Amino acid sequence: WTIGIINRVVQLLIISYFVGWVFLHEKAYQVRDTAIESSVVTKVKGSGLYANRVMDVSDYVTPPQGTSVFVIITKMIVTENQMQGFCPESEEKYRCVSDSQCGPERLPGGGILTGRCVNYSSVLRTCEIQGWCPTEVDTVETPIMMEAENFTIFIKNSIRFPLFNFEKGNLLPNLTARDMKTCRFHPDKDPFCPILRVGDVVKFAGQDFAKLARTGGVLGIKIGWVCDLDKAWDQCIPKYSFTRLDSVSVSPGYNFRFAKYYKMENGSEYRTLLKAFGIRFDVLVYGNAGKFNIIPTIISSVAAFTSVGVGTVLCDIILLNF
Amino acid sequence: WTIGIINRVVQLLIISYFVGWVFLHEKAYQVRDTAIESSVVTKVKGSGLYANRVMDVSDYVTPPQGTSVFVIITKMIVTENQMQGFCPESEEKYRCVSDSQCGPERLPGGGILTGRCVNYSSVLRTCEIQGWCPTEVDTVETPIMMEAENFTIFIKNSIRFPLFNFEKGNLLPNLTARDMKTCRFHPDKDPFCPILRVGDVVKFAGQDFAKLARTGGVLGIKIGWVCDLDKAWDQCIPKYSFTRLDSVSVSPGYNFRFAKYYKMENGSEYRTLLKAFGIRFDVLVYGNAGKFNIIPTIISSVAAFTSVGVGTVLCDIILLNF
Amino acid sequence: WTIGIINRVVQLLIISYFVGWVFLHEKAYQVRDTAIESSVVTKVKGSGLYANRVMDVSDYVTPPQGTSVFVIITKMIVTENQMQGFCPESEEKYRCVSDSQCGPERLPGGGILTGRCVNYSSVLRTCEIQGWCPTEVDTVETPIMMEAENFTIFIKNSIRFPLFNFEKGNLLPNLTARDMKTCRFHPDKDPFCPILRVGDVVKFAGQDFAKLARTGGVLGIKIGWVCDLDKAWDQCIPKYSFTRLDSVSVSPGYNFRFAKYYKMENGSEYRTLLKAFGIRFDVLVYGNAGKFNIIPTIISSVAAFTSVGVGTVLCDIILLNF
Ligand SMILES: *[C@@H]1O[C@H](CO)[C@@H](O)[C@H](O)[C@H]1NC(C)=O
Ligand SMILES: *[C@@H]1O[C@H](CO)[C@@H](O)[C@H](O)[C@H]1NC(C)=O
Ligand SMILES: *[C@@H]1O[C@H](CO)[C@@H](O)[C@H](O)[C@H]1NC(C)=O
Ligand SMILES: *[C@@H]1O[C@H](CO)[C@@H](O)[C@H](O)[C@H]1NC(C)=O
Ligand SMILES: *[C@@H]1O[C@H](CO)[C@@H](O)[C@H](O)[C@H]1NC(C)=O
Ligand SMILES: *[C@@H]1O[C@H](CO)[C@@H](O)[C@H](O)[C@H]1NC(C)=O
Ligand SMILES: *[C@@H]1O[C@H](CO)[C@@H](O)[C@H](O)[C@H]1NC(C)=O
Ligand SMILES: *[C@@H]1O[C@H](CO)[C@@H](O)[C@H](O)[C@H]1NC(C)=O
Ligand SMILES: *[C@@H]1O[C@H](CO)[C@@H](O)[C@H](O)[C@H]1NC(C)=O
Ligand SMILES: [Mg+2]
Ligand SMILES: [Mg+2]
Ligand SMILES: [Mg+2]
Ligand code: NA
């Protein structure tokens, strides 16, 4: 009967259309390179005021080379003119009543205890320690550099998909609305401008610059390179997203210690101990490209052929039985 | 004959069970994301004694920011109060008999030779050089900071599988036996505590802290995120492993040079040249996730269907022929 | 007819040979690990002359630890003995006629303006600023360190394919023609020597050391680990390639700022501000391994079986119809 082939032809049309659209949607004919090879060069610009001092890129940016991870110092605690010696620790956790509880068994991971119980102040009595004296007092409150909100981060990113040897950069003057020197990234108005405003990055991550600068934190500038290398070079485009990575028992924030080492004319050594709170920026470059390939196209082909060949039988059984 | 379908039914049961278990074991129905996107923040804690000096995190940890690669300095060689000028190199390799063998053709990659053969000491005669004087003597023996064995490394790791947009952290208070502030990673007792004892890490890597601290080395704290995103969020868990990466013509160990730059009141410049031996720690975050997908499930389906369809024919040929 | 099976047998021979060679060429029977896990330790060696000063590894290499990204400083601009205060900016862009155009609304991202229009020189009048004085003059011309062309970069690379747990290093004494201590990488004569001549790396990247050292730049030492883990351990070999990553509205080159901080005996602080131009080196380790696997071999098998089964029908239709 001719209707039998009109029923079968309809079966193949519909079923083959479902399978076809499904496989075509997932790019099942494409080999994928998900091992992007990226280089990141960052440049921070701005100047701020902290106490009655002016901080420039050489003062608050660390490291200086413009790597993918850098830190903008927003608040800091200074302990000036430290020198090796003995002194009573100012941390209450080191409180003692006699030299019998200042032995090596107490606070094993802490500082070096001399074994004497000494009077830090009239209200506290702590174990004496050998090290940089006086000791740090990290419980005071200090200001934060507010101008850091207006600083700019310029990200030059040069990536390459090695499976296809397709390398490209994120400096695209044609895609930017304004000049590169004066543009400013906006997710909607200028989403390809490589210049980001620090405060902007803090907002895109859903963070308050006040609390963040106060406690420090870790933000991620995410560069995504999802690309169809079957299309034009013009179509492989970077997409920027933003997130706070420290998020959140453990106290939030981000700080690290470093000293400025000075020596006296008579030769003795003394340092300035600095506890730095700031916003660390991690440039995270993800990317995956898809290029047409014979092997995945054949495997997907056989898959759709056989799958349709079974679906038509099952649909005949469902129809005829009814 | 009915037995013919009892033989065929048994064929399909057994063969289909083999194929089924095989494909089900390898998660052939899952798409895999092997491009984890990780952020690492490290914090070292401890104090040590070197010579008659006390080293704190600002003295022996480099860099300070808490990156994925950092160095704990265990032994160092100091050459104090260097100043630009001319002096005889102390390296024997520069030995000379006359100014005729101190020309630019000799040791091209080394220091800057003035062209004079001078007497470093009464027992050695070396080419004179222009640079920081006096020169370094890196053949002496110096102590090592033993307290570094008791230092602690705290690793906060925040990763994300982008193909699925599944981001998670390694601070899991529910999985840890003790409090986060006081716990300590143990592969068996507390395998999710992010706090590692330096000496412990040295042991897990099969290394002697004495020799390692003496010669320096490169260890890797490996964080693995193998995850089945079909299961609960609770099931995606990090697993820590440890290894020595420098391992091993070339002399083992790890050291690097840096100077502390001082200036005189009259304005002349002089530095302290430091050769640092320590244990570099590389946080290596691997991970791959698997999520059920329609395309791989269909491809695997067709594969098992056809493969069974052929296996039953071959098994009929093997049975009937016998 | 017997010829019918001689036509079919020829069909299967030829078609099955095409399909077979195609699938065998692309390693369709292999699972692939494209998430290499690499560790990079770099060591720079050399000494140069800048002005009448000698620069050693502690002077021009930054950072010092030997990471995968480091900078060899070739030219620099010094601004000595800066001190916090007020002074007229030397940048023409800050030119003013009266204190009415030195308000906060002007150059928002720049330095801190006091609000006064002052005379930097007799030929220029600029806004006064608070910060490190005097200000930097980055428009002068300075020399470049030419000896940096003869410096050597030693790259120790230790990688691991985790899906197969196959870890290996790039120090291969058997593969090198010369001793490791004295060899020197040559793409043809010694392509496995880990010691690279800086000038050589500049040439392999198609760059002129004069212009590059003058303006600075970003080069990539690419280490590729394409491996067939079905073959011998001896066959997994690294291949080195080279490229300039900054390439290229924006001014080319690479520079960054850092200061040397000194303090006076009376306690006042003053720094030496340094603008550094050099060649940043990014070690980029790519790699992907392929190991025989049952699942991909079965999927590829079914694919070739069905594809041939259809190709023979189509070829019968093409032949018989003719
Ligand atoms: C580590 O600390 C313990 C105290 O908890 C102490 O007994 C031990 O001697 C320390 N180890 C070293 C190497 O100092
Ligand atoms: C950039 O713009 C010019 C217009 O003058 C155009 O010819 C060129 O193709 C553009 N490049 C890309 C990558 O679109
Ligand atoms: C160096 O001088 C300072 C004060 O000028 C003094 O505190 C210190 O003890 C001196 N160093 C030595 C080793 O005497
Ligand atoms: C590099 O060293 C060789 C000696 O091996 C020397 O002849 C040459 O001039 C050096 N190159 C530069 C740029 O100084
Ligand atoms: C953590 O512990 C609480 C117990 O109060 C539990 O309700 C919560 O689900 C746990 N979180 C995870 C991720 O297991
Ligand atoms: C600075 O003084 C030191 C000794 O105080 C001396 O060695 C040096 O030559 C002086 N510098 C100059 C340029 O005279
Ligand atoms: C940022 O700059 C603008 C001028 O463009 C200024 O009005 C604003 O106050 C600045 N923001 C901060 C936090 O100083
Ligand atoms: C290195 O060389 C020795 C020759 O003495 C050889 O036995 C060994 O197998 C070689 N190693 C590799 C990895 O080829
Ligand atoms: C410290 O001395 C220098 C000159 O020796 C002077 O310029 C500066 O004003 C002094 N500092 C203070 C706070 O007086
Ligand atoms: Mg404290
Ligand atoms: Mg030496
Ligand atoms: Mg300027
Ligand atoms: Na298939």
PDB file of all heavy atoms in Angstrom, chain A residues 129-151, unseen atoms left out:
ATOM      1  N   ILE A 129      59.170  37.344  74.098  1.00  0.00           N
ATOM      2  CA  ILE A 129      59.570  36.681  72.867  1.00  0.00           C
ATOM      3  C   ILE A 129      60.788  37.380  72.281  1.00  0.00           C
ATOM      4  O   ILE A 129      61.053  38.559  72.546  1.00  0.00           O
ATOM      5  CB  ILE A 129      58.426  36.637  71.828  1.00  0.00           C
ATOM      6  CG1 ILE A 129      57.921  38.047  71.505  1.00  0.00           C
ATOM      7  CG2 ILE A 129      57.287  35.763  72.325  1.00  0.00           C
ATOM      8  CD1 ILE A 129      58.731  38.770  70.449  1.00  0.00           C
ATOM      9  N   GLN A 130      61.531  36.621  71.479  1.00  0.00           N
ATOM     10  CA  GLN A 130      62.662  37.124  70.714  1.00  0.00           C
ATOM     11  C   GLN A 130      62.227  37.316  69.266  1.00  0.00           C
ATOM     12  O   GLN A 130      61.647  36.407  68.662  1.00  0.00           O
ATOM     13  CB  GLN A 130      63.847  36.157  70.794  1.00  0.00           C
ATOM     14  CG  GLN A 130      65.059  36.566  69.972  1.00  0.00           C
ATOM     15  CD  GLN A 130      66.193  35.562  70.066  1.00  0.00           C
ATOM     16  OE1 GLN A 130      66.169  34.655  70.898  1.00  0.00           O
ATOM     17  NE2 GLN A 130      67.194  35.717  69.208  1.00  0.00           N
ATOM     18  N   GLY A 131      62.501  38.495  68.723  1.00  0.00           N
ATOM     19  CA  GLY A 131      62.078  38.822  67.376  1.00  0.00           C
ATOM     20  C   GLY A 131      62.073  40.328  67.181  1.00  0.00           C
ATOM     21  O   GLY A 131      62.736  41.064  67.910  1.00  0.00           O
ATOM     22  N   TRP A 132      61.310  40.759  66.181  1.00  0.00           N
ATOM     23  CA  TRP A 132      61.236  42.175  65.850  1.00  0.00           C
ATOM     24  C   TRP A 132      60.440  42.917  66.917  1.00  0.00           C
ATOM     25  O   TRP A 132      59.255  42.638  67.126  1.00  0.00           O
ATOM     26  CB  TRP A 132      60.612  42.353  64.469  1.00  0.00           C
ATOM     27  CG  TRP A 132      61.418  41.695  63.386  1.00  0.00           C
ATOM     28  CD1 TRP A 132      61.230  40.448  62.861  1.00  0.00           C
ATOM     29  CD2 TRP A 132      62.557  42.244  62.713  1.00  0.00           C
ATOM     30  NE1 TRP A 132      62.175  40.192  61.896  1.00  0.00           N
ATOM     31  CE2 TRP A 132      63.001  41.280  61.786  1.00  0.00           C
ATOM     32  CE3 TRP A 132      63.240  43.461  62.801  1.00  0.00           C
ATOM     33  CZ2 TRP A 132      64.097  41.494  60.954  1.00  0.00           C
ATOM     34  CZ3 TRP A 132      64.326  43.671  61.975  1.00  0.00           C
ATOM     35  CH2 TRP A 132      64.745  42.693  61.064  1.00  0.00           C
ATOM     36  N   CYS A 133      61.097  43.854  67.594  1.00  0.00           N
ATOM     37  CA  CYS A 133      60.483  44.619  68.670  1.00  0.00           C
ATOM     38  C   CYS A 133      60.465  46.108  68.346  1.00  0.00           C
ATOM     39  O   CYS A 133      61.410  46.633  67.749  1.00  0.00           O
ATOM     40  CB  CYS A 133      61.223  44.383  69.989  1.00  0.00           C
ATOM     41  SG  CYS A 133      61.184  42.671  70.564  1.00  0.00           S
ATOM     42  N   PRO A 134      59.384  46.795  68.744  1.00  0.00           N
ATOM     43  CA  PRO A 134      58.261  46.188  69.465  1.00  0.00           C
ATOM     44  C   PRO A 134      57.418  45.269  68.584  1.00  0.00           C
ATOM     45  O   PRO A 134      57.664  45.174  67.385  1.00  0.00           O
ATOM     46  CB  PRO A 134      57.443  47.398  69.917  1.00  0.00           C
ATOM     47  CG  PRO A 134      57.730  48.433  68.898  1.00  0.00           C
ATOM     48  CD  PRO A 134      59.164  48.228  68.490  1.00  0.00           C
ATOM     49  N   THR A 135      56.432  44.601  69.178  1.00  0.00           N
ATOM     50  CA  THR A 135      55.582  43.693  68.427  1.00  0.00           C
ATOM     51  C   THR A 135      54.443  44.458  67.754  1.00  0.00           C
ATOM     52  O   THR A 135      54.172  45.623  68.055  1.00  0.00           O
ATOM     53  CB  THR A 135      55.024  42.598  69.337  1.00  0.00           C
ATOM     54  OG1 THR A 135      54.111  43.172  70.279  1.00  0.00           O
ATOM     55  CG2 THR A 135      56.151  41.906  70.091  1.00  0.00           C
ATOM     56  N   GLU A 136      53.773  43.783  66.825  1.00  0.00           N
ATOM     57  CA  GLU A 136      52.686  44.400  66.081  1.00  0.00           C
ATOM     58  C   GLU A 136      51.402  44.413  66.903  1.00  0.00           C
ATOM     59  O   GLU A 136      51.132  43.501  67.689  1.00  0.00           O
ATOM     60  CB  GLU A 136      52.448  43.665  64.759  1.00  0.00           C
ATOM     61  CG  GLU A 136      51.209  44.129  64.006  1.00  0.00           C
ATOM     62  CD  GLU A 136      51.157  43.596  62.586  1.00  0.00           C
ATOM     63  OE1 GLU A 136      50.975  42.376  62.405  1.00  0.00           O
ATOM     64  OE2 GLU A 136      51.311  44.406  61.645  1.00  0.00           O
ATOM     65  N   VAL A 137      50.610  45.461  66.708  1.00  0.00           N
ATOM     66  CA  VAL A 137      49.299  45.593  67.338  1.00  0.00           C
ATOM     67  C   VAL A 137      48.292  45.705  66.199  1.00  0.00           C
ATOM     68  O   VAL A 137      48.007  46.797  65.706  1.00  0.00           O
ATOM     69  CB  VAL A 137      49.219  46.795  68.279  1.00  0.00           C
ATOM     70  CG1 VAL A 137      47.876  46.817  68.997  1.00  0.00           C
ATOM     71  CG2 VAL A 137      50.362  46.743  69.268  1.00  0.00           C
ATOM     72  N   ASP A 138      47.745  44.565  65.778  1.00  0.00           N
ATOM     73  CA  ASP A 138      46.851  44.489  64.633  1.00  0.00           C
ATOM     74  C   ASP A 138      45.382  44.596  65.022  1.00  0.00           C
ATOM     75  O   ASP A 138      44.510  44.206  64.235  1.00  0.00           O
ATOM     76  CB  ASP A 138      47.098  43.191  63.858  1.00  0.00           C
ATOM     77  CG  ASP A 138      47.227  41.980  64.766  1.00  0.00           C
ATOM     78  OD1 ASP A 138      48.354  41.710  65.232  1.00  0.00           O
ATOM     79  OD2 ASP A 138      46.210  41.295  65.006  1.00  0.00           O
ATOM     80  N   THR A 139      45.087  45.114  66.211  1.00  0.00           N
ATOM     81  CA  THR A 139      43.716  45.283  66.671  1.00  0.00           C
ATOM     82  C   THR A 139      43.246  46.730  66.616  1.00  0.00           C
ATOM     83  O   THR A 139      42.115  47.014  67.019  1.00  0.00           O
ATOM     84  CB  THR A 139      43.564  44.745  68.100  1.00  0.00           C
ATOM     85  OG1 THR A 139      44.592  45.294  68.936  1.00  0.00           O
ATOM     86  CG2 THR A 139      43.658  43.226  68.105  1.00  0.00           C
ATOM     87  N   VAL A 140      44.081  47.647  66.128  1.00  0.00           N
ATOM     88  CA  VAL A 140      43.701  49.051  66.003  1.00  0.00           C
ATOM     89  C   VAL A 140      42.898  49.232  64.721  1.00  0.00           C
ATOM     90  O   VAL A 140      42.864  48.341  63.866  1.00  0.00           O
ATOM     91  CB  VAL A 140      44.940  49.964  66.019  1.00  0.00           C
ATOM     92  CG1 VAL A 140      44.533  51.429  66.121  1.00  0.00           C
ATOM     93  CG2 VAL A 140      45.863  49.577  67.163  1.00  0.00           C
ATOM     94  N   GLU A 141      42.246  50.383  64.579  1.00  0.00           N
ATOM     95  CA  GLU A 141      41.481  50.718  63.386  1.00  0.00           C
ATOM     96  C   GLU A 141      42.235  51.775  62.591  1.00  0.00           C
ATOM     97  O   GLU A 141      42.724  52.755  63.166  1.00  0.00           O
ATOM     98  CB  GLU A 141      40.084  51.222  63.753  1.00  0.00           C
ATOM     99  N   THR A 142      42.332  51.578  61.285  1.00  0.00           N
ATOM    100  CA  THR A 142      43.059  52.468  60.400  1.00  0.00           C
ATOM    101  C   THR A 142      42.183  52.858  59.223  1.00  0.00           C
ATOM    102  O   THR A 142      41.191  52.178  58.924  1.00  0.00           O
ATOM    103  CB  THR A 142      44.350  51.813  59.888  1.00  0.00           C
ATOM    104  OG1 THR A 142      44.052  50.501  59.393  1.00  0.00           O
ATOM    105  CG2 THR A 142      45.372  51.703  61.012  1.00  0.00           C
ATOM    106  N   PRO A 143      42.510  53.945  58.538  1.00  0.00           N
ATOM    107  CA  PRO A 143      41.693  54.383  57.403  1.00  0.00           C
ATOM    108  C   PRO A 143      41.871  53.471  56.199  1.00  0.00           C
ATOM    109  O   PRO A 143      42.676  52.541  56.195  1.00  0.00           O
ATOM    110  CB  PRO A 143      42.208  55.795  57.120  1.00  0.00           C
ATOM    111  CG  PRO A 143      43.642  55.746  57.554  1.00  0.00           C
ATOM    112  CD  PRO A 143      43.672  54.827  58.750  1.00  0.00           C
ATOM    113  N   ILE A 144      41.082  53.749  55.165  1.00  0.00           N
ATOM    114  CA  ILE A 144      41.170  53.040  53.897  1.00  0.00           C
ATOM    115  C   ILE A 144      41.294  54.063  52.776  1.00  0.00           C
ATOM    116  O   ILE A 144      40.763  55.174  52.861  1.00  0.00           O
ATOM    117  CB  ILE A 144      39.959  52.109  53.657  1.00  0.00           C
ATOM    118  CG1 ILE A 144      38.685  52.931  53.464  1.00  0.00           C
ATOM    119  CG2 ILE A 144      39.794  51.151  54.822  1.00  0.00           C
ATOM    120  CD1 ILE A 144      37.445  52.093  53.256  1.00  0.00           C
ATOM    121  N   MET A 145      42.004  53.679  51.720  1.00  0.00           N
ATOM    122  CA  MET A 145      42.239  54.559  50.581  1.00  0.00           C
ATOM    123  C   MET A 145      41.005  54.539  49.687  1.00  0.00           C
ATOM    124  O   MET A 145      40.751  53.553  48.988  1.00  0.00           O
ATOM    125  CB  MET A 145      43.488  54.114  49.828  1.00  0.00           C
ATOM    126  CG  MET A 145      43.995  55.125  48.815  1.00  0.00           C
ATOM    127  SD  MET A 145      45.646  54.704  48.231  1.00  0.00           S
ATOM    128  CE  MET A 145      45.379  53.053  47.585  1.00  0.00           C
ATOM    129  N   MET A 146      40.236  55.630  49.708  1.00  0.00           N
ATOM    130  CA  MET A 146      38.987  55.673  48.957  1.00  0.00           C
ATOM    131  C   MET A 146      39.211  55.939  47.475  1.00  0.00           C
ATOM    132  O   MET A 146      38.435  55.460  46.641  1.00  0.00           O
ATOM    133  CB  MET A 146      38.055  56.738  49.543  1.00  0.00           C
ATOM    134  CG  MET A 146      37.568  56.430  50.949  1.00  0.00           C
ATOM    135  SD  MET A 146      36.627  54.892  51.024  1.00  0.00           S
ATOM    136  CE  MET A 146      36.103  54.904  52.737  1.00  0.00           C
ATOM    137  N   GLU A 147      40.258  56.691  47.127  1.00  0.00           N
ATOM    138  CA  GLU A 147      40.535  56.963  45.721  1.00  0.00           C
ATOM    139  C   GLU A 147      40.732  55.684  44.915  1.00  0.00           C
ATOM    140  O   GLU A 147      40.581  55.710  43.689  1.00  0.00           O
ATOM    141  CB  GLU A 147      41.772  57.855  45.580  1.00  0.00           C
ATOM    142  CG  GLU A 147      41.634  59.242  46.189  1.00  0.00           C
ATOM    143  CD  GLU A 147      41.822  59.247  47.694  1.00  0.00           C
ATOM    144  OE1 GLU A 147      41.854  58.153  48.298  1.00  0.00           O
ATOM    145  OE2 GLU A 147      41.941  60.347  48.274  1.00  0.00           O
ATOM    146  N   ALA A 148      41.066  54.569  45.572  1.00  0.00           N
ATOM    147  CA  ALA A 148      41.261  53.314  44.856  1.00  0.00           C
ATOM    148  C   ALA A 148      40.017  52.887  44.090  1.00  0.00           C
ATOM    149  O   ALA A 148      40.118  52.072  43.166  1.00  0.00           O
ATOM    150  CB  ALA A 148      41.680  52.213  45.829  1.00  0.00           C
ATOM    151  N   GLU A 149      38.848  53.416  44.456  1.00  0.00           N
ATOM    152  CA  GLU A 149      37.630  53.091  43.722  1.00  0.00           C
ATOM    153  C   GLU A 149      37.681  53.618  42.295  1.00  0.00           C
ATOM    154  O   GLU A 149      37.086  53.021  41.390  1.00  0.00           O
ATOM    155  CB  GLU A 149      36.418  53.656  44.463  1.00  0.00           C
ATOM    156  CG  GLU A 149      35.080  53.100  44.019  1.00  0.00           C
ATOM    157  CD  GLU A 149      33.924  53.702  44.797  1.00  0.00           C
ATOM    158  OE1 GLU A 149      34.111  54.774  45.412  1.00  0.00           O
ATOM    159  OE2 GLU A 149      32.829  53.101  44.797  1.00  0.00           O
ATOM    160  N   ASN A 150      38.388  54.723  42.072  1.00  0.00           N
ATOM    161  CA  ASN A 150      38.475  55.350  40.761  1.00  0.00           C
ATOM    162  C   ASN A 150      39.686  54.893  39.957  1.00  0.00           C
ATOM    163  O   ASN A 150      39.893  55.392  38.846  1.00  0.00           O
ATOM    164  CB  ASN A 150      38.510  56.874  40.909  1.00  0.00           C
ATOM    165  CG  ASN A 150      37.121  57.493  40.968  1.00  0.00           C
ATOM    166  OD1 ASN A 150      36.111  56.796  41.082  1.00  0.00           O
ATOM    167  ND2 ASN A 150      37.076  58.820  40.893  1.00  0.00           N
ATOM    168  N   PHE A 151      40.492  53.974  40.484  1.00  0.00           N
ATOM    169  CA  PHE A 151      41.613  53.453  39.718  1.00  0.00           C
ATOM    170  C   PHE A 151      41.105  52.626  38.540  1.00  0.00           C
ATOM    171  O   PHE A 151      39.967  52.147  38.528  1.00  0.00           O
ATOM    172  CB  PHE A 151      42.524  52.594  40.596  1.00  0.00           C
ATOM    173  CG  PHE A 151      43.176  53.344  41.720  1.00  0.00           C
ATOM    174  CD1 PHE A 151      43.775  52.660  42.767  1.00  0.00           C
ATOM    175  CD2 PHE A 151      43.200  54.729  41.734  1.00  0.00           C
ATOM    176  CE1 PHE A 151      44.381  53.345  43.806  1.00  0.00           C
ATOM    177  CE2 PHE A 151      43.803  55.416  42.771  1.00  0.00           C
ATOM    178  CZ  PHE A 151      44.393  54.724  43.808  1.00  0.00           C
TER     179      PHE A 151
END
